[PDB]
Design a binder for this molecule. Sequence first.
Ligand SMILES: COc1cccc(Cl)c1CC(=O)N1C[C@H](C(N)=O)C[C@H](C(=O)NC2CC2)C1
Ligand SMILES: [Zn+2]
Length: 139
Amino acid sequence: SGAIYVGNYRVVNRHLATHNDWANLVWEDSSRDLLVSSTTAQGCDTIARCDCQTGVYYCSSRRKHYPVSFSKPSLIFVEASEYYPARYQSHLMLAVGHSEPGDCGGILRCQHGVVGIVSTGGNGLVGFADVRDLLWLDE
Ligand SMILES: COc1cccc(Cl)c1CC(=O)N1C[C@H](C(N)=O)C[C@H](C(=O)NC2CC2)C1
Ligand SMILES: [Zn+2]
């Protein structure tokens, strides 16, 4: 679990969105595993606007942050799950690192701010849903 709080927006994994997130829906994209809902309180985070390929992510299954090298946002085949059929997930960045299903929502950050959130993983891999292209989050 985990979310990004920027301005009056809350960004979460679409598969983990609550009834309240859907009741206050701003935007969602099943192909990216992202959902954005509106909030009444001002958010704590800054979004990176960069092309960094190194950063640090929080891994809740180890209670630790790990430094990673990650690929550029791209279309990656993701296996079938309880929430989605076998499909290509877009704007996904892969890295070598530990992750478990419950790590989804852990934030990936670089020196410029929030890059994305954990969305996929397996066998010593971790995938992050990019948010740097969502310029409207800053206004
Ligand atoms: C960090 O995730 C993992 C890490 C290690 C191994 C594995 Cl199988 C995962 C899990 C993974 O890849 N998905 C990705 C998927 C998607 N974004 O399309 C959403 C999936 C889902 O339905 N989760 C709910 C709790 C059961 C979980
Ligand atoms: Zn950066």
